[PDB]
Design a protein around this ligand. Structure first.
Ligand SMILES: [K+]
Length: 282
């Protein structure tokens, strides 16, 4: 199975005029990074709706993962589900990004651009989709096997899923945020895996990335304490090989230098009064 190269993009998919666009659509940058990390009860309830819809779009596209299919076709499906449910796909026009989800095969760490790329037997593909509705975002992702995937790669996927769920299950108010990345990295290193450092989880609410950073590796210098009403992603990228990467000329696609495969899972989480609630569930 050869190292991936860029396929060709389908044209911009329309979304109905009546679906509110985030402010950043059609602009070179977003107005984000200084928004409160704790959400009002109103925004939390709305994020339940956005997260539910993202989860559905994820589940739908992931159902179409099969040898023969294009990444572009996964995007079509995710886009349709978001649009049919009244949601704007948050990635569409986010800093110029051209599609409605990210599709990240094999050695693509993250930010892959749905295209003419045809999935083959044994590949793994991450699909990351975000919903914007009622003025808020919800983001979820998962890595899906295509065909007869090698044990090596199944285990990577299952272990990355597990790391993520372990980390989620440590979320509680009064606990150090740094606990997330300690749990993740300790679990990954157990199997000889390497945790991506340069890409992180983030606060999410009325803005896509509100400036809160959630590290997935052990970094006990972070002082941030989790508080009820905080909303953020946990989204570890976990590599079979070394952390060294390249970005393609499209400006988005992140690939492992060594071309070894990598996996990722993600939810949008609420810190409740007593623990956690996963917002990106069906
Ligand atoms: K990947």
């Amino acid at each position: 199975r050869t190292a991936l190269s860029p396929g060709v993009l389908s044209p911009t998919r329309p979304v109905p005029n009546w679906i509110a666009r985030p402010e950043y659509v059609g602009k070179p940058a977003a107005q984000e990074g200084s928004e409160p990390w704790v959400q009002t009860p109103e925004v939390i309830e709305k994020m339940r709706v956005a997260g539910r819809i993202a989860a559905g779009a994820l589940a739908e596209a992931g159902k179409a993962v099969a040898p023969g299919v294009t990444t572009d076709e996964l995007d079509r499906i995710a886009h349709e589900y978001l649009v049919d449910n009244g949601a704007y796909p948050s990635t569409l026009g986010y800093k110029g990004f051209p599609k409605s989800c990210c599709t990240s095969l094999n050695e693509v760490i993250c930010h892959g651009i749905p295209d003419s790329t045809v999935i083959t037997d044994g590949d793994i593909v991450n699909i990351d989709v975000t919903a914007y509705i009622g003025g808020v975002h919800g983001d979820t992702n998962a890595t899906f096997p295509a065909g007869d995937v090698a044990d090596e790669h199944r285990l990577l996927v299952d272990r990355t899923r597990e790391a993520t769920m372990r980390a989620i299950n440590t979320v509680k108010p009064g606990r150090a945020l740094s606990v997330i990345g300690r749990v993740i990295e300790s679990y990954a290193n157990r199997f000889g895996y390497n945790v991506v450092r340069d890409f992180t989880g983030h606060g999410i609410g009325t803005t896509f990335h509100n400036g809160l950073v959630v590290l997935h590796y052990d970094q006990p210098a972070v002082e941030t304490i989790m508080q009820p009403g905080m909303t953020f992603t946990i989204e570890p990228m976990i590599n079979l090989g070394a952390l060294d990467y390249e970005i393609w000329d499209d400006g988005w696609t992140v690939v492992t230098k060594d071309r070894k495969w990598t996996a990722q899972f993600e939810h949008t989480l609420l810190v409740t009064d007593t623990g956690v609630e996963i917002l990106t569930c069906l």
